[PDB]
Each structure stands twice: as structure tokens, then as C-alpha cells.
Design a protein around this nucleic acid. Structure first.
Lengths: 134, 143
DNA sequence: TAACTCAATCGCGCGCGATTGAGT
DNA sequence: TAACTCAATCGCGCGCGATTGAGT
């Protein structure tokens, strides 16, 4: 009984924490007209450019069911180019635009100006991953 | 110093993102039998601790509003977990009350989830604290 | 042909910023 | 008349289980 009481408060906290993070980031990012999830995509691209959609998804644990509509939005607001690979026409190469690369510093400053754990999350992250399989 | 503190906030934000998605995935798997969602579960938890409540009250417990809870309490009524009825004293209000089935099925739902929790559960109390800390930190950061 | 691997698509339920309109 | 306080509604962007159809 008490092991359920723990899982619930812990689940519920994670639920509250992620919403709050999103709320916060979205407030700061409103200037740029990008969402929290779009920001997470742009982080991976700022760390490695270009990437395939599938590669981005692997970094974020997301798939085309989320990234397809959403990379289309980032293209439509000038952050990225979506183009097909010649080696493999099934693939989709995502490449940052100049504007997309350029605005990183501005975006990071917009958020930074308003600012054990990291381990504890990664622990639970890996615990849950296993629970979804075996 | 200028930048490395951002790299911390990002990995921490991204971890919380991943953790909550996984928690939802897990609970949704176990709750499929009962035909309820994670969020619906969270609403049922507050009702199992206090019944009846007004939609506004539930929302206060979960930091949600009618923009989420209206469509969703309608779903729980349709699957026989709750009654949605307006108050006489104040016709604006909406009283949510658990159905017998709704009350009754708590034990079964808890068991369905608890049976799949690893024995890894009197050395996770640290975690529960660390979350609540960040939860409160973030809540102040928004205001 | 076939098996495979991709992004794209579909349907649905949230979250939530914003607005509406009923009721006090 | 007004100031309030509610749930309901609207529009949009996710997440994601599932399917599709193009390409290898």
C-alpha cells in the first residue's frame, strides 16, 4: 500500500514539474515564436547540424508522429530546412537556417537572464524505461 | 559560469520531460484494462481522497482548470466513473461525485499498478523530496 | 516479386492562453 | 446598470498507438 502512495506522489510531482518547466520556458520563448518542444529540437540541432529526423527523434525519444508536423512548423517560421537525402530518398535531412543558427545566443540569453537532482532524474528515467519493457 | 549553468537547467528540464512521459506511458499501460487515461487517473485520485468536489476544487489540487477538466470530466461521466451535477445554492458551480462503480474500482486499479512496481521501493524517499523542492522552486520562478 | 525501413498520416486526449456567456 | 465568479468553449500544439505508402 505504501509503495503505491510513493509512486503516485512521485508520478504526480514529475507531472507538475514538467508542466512548470514548459510554462516557464514558453514564457521566455514567446518573443521568438517557438514552443518548448521546438526548443528541445533546436537544442539538439545547435549541438549537431544537420541531422535526420530519425536522429533527432532518437535524441529526444520521439518519432515522426510528433516530429513531422513540428519540423514543418519550424521550417514555416524560418528556423530549419527540410530536404530529402539523395543516397536514400526515404530519409529527411533537417538543417538549420542561418537565422536558426544565429539566434541561439539570443535565445539562451533570454532564458538565462531569468534563472544531485540531475542524477536522481536519470536514475528514475532508466528505472521507468525498463518497466515499460520487462 | 555564464553558460554552464544553462547546460544544467536544460538537461534537468529535458530529464523532467522524459520522466513524466515515461510515468504516463507506464500508468497508461496498466490502466488500459479500465479504459482510463493518466490524467483521468489523477482526477480519480483526488476524488478517492475527497468526494464530492467542485471542478474548481479538483483543478486547484492538480493545477488545472475547466479548459482541461470540462471535456475530461465529461469523458469520466460517459464511462460511468462520476456524476456531473450543478449545485442549487450556486448554479454556476459543478459538483463532481464518484459513482458506486467509481469508488468500488479503486482497490482493483491500485492493485493493477502496484503488482507491477519493482521491489526497489524504502530508498526512494530522497527522490520524492528532491522533486517537491524543484516543484516549489519552479512555481516561484513563474511569478 | 519480397522484406525492410523510413516519413507521413490518422485519431484522440490532453494542457493551456484566451474568450464567452451564464449566473450571483 | 455594474463588478464578480464560475464552467464551458475555442484554437493550437503536442505525444503517441496505430496505419499508410513511398522508396530500398
Amino acid at each position: 500500500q505504501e509503495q503505491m502512495r510513493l509512486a503516485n506522489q512521485l508520478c504526480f510531482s514529475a507531472y507538475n514539474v514538467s508542466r512548470l518547466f514548459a510554462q516557464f520556458y514558453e514564457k521566455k520563448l514567446k518573443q521568438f515564436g517557438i514552443t518548448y518542444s521546438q526548443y528541445l529540437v533546436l537544442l539538439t540541432l545547435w549541438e549537431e547540424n544537420p541531422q535526420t529526423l530519425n536522429s533527432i527523434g532518437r535524441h529526444l525519444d520521439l518519432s515522426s508522429n510528433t516530429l513531422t508536423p513540428m519540423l514543418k512548423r519550424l521550417e514555416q517560421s524560418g528556423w530549419v530546412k527540410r530536404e530529402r537525402q539523395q543516397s536514400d530518398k526515404r530519409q529527411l535531412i533537417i538543417t538549420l537556417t542561418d537565422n536558426g543558427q544565429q539566434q541561439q545566443e539570443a535565445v539562451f540569453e533570454a532564458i538565462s537572464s531569468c534563472l544531485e537532482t540531475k542524477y536522481v532524474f536519470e536514475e528514475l528515467e532508466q528505472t521507468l524505461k525498463h518497466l515499460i519493457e520487462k
